[PDB]
Each structure stands twice: as C-alpha cells, then as structure tokens.
RNA sequence: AGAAGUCCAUUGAACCUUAUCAUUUAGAGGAAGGAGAAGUCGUAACAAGGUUUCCGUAGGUGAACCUGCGGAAGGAUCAUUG
C-alpha cells in the first residue's frame, strides 16, 4: 500500500523545517513548483 | 389764587428672599504628566531580538510584561496541477 499525508504548516514551522526558504525579491514572485 | 399736609394710582431707584447662567478666586489632602551628563532591578522591542511581531477583548504578575479567544502581515512563506 501507500501512505497519504496532507501536511499544513504555519510560516514559522515551514521556514524552520526548510519546507520553504527565504528567496530574493525577484525570485519570490515565482509561483511555479520546483521541477 | 393758593403753601404745608393728606388719599389712591403711575414711573420706579434701593434693599431682602429663591433659583439659574457668566467671569474670577481660597482650599487640608489626593492623584496625573513633563524636564533634568554620568542612580537601582531586570531585558520587553529592534536579527526568527533568541517564545515572530502587532490589533481588539479578558484575566494575572516588582517592572518591563505573560497568558486565553478571534483577527492582520506592517512575516521569517507572493510557490506543490503535489
Ligand atoms: K515578546
Ligand atoms: K518581529
Ligand atoms: K515581588
Ligand atoms: Mg528580548
Ligand atoms: Mg527570551
Ligand atoms: Mg520575542
């Protein structure tokens, strides 16, 4: 079988866990998911 | 013709009583704010200020402040068709 989990993070946890990272002023306007 | 005086009315000063406004003013004591080179205790905010910050509301702690509920990004995320 497979395990399905939807994770919903607050901003602080998302940054600390490195789910998202601080980007440059121009790079934070990019909305497409990473390849 | 006519004075003093006298009678009742009118105008009505001045005074007394009641109350209301306006302008000043005394007051034992209480409690606020501000200013002043080198006071004490912490370190609340500025970096993720080391528990992200802040708004409303409620409660509680020497003090800054902490906590609960809902909210904002002025966030530390403009982003999973994964
Ligand atoms: K704090
Ligand atoms: K902050
Ligand atoms: K004390
Ligand atoms: Mg501090
Ligand atoms: Mg601390
Ligand atoms: Mg803090």
UniProtKB/TrEMBL annotation:
Domain of life: Eukaryota
Keywords from the UniProt entry: Ribonucleoprotein, Ribosomal protein
Keyword Ribonucleoprotein assigned: yes
GO molecular function terms listed in the Swiss-Prot or TrEMBL record: mRNA binding; structural constituent of ribosome
Gene Ontology biological process: translation
Gene Ontology, cellular component aspect: cytosolic small ribosomal subunit
Family: Belongs to the eukaryotic ribosomal protein eS26 family.
Protein name, UniProt field: 40S ribosomal protein S26
Phylogenetic placement of the source organism: Eukaryota, Viridiplantae, Streptophyta, Embryophyta, Tracheophyta
């Amino acid at each position: 079988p497979k395990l399905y989990l939807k994770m919903q993070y607050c901003v602080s946890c998302a940054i600390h866990s490195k789910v998202v990272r601080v980007r440059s002023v121009t790079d934070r306007r990019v909305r497409e998911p990473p390849q």
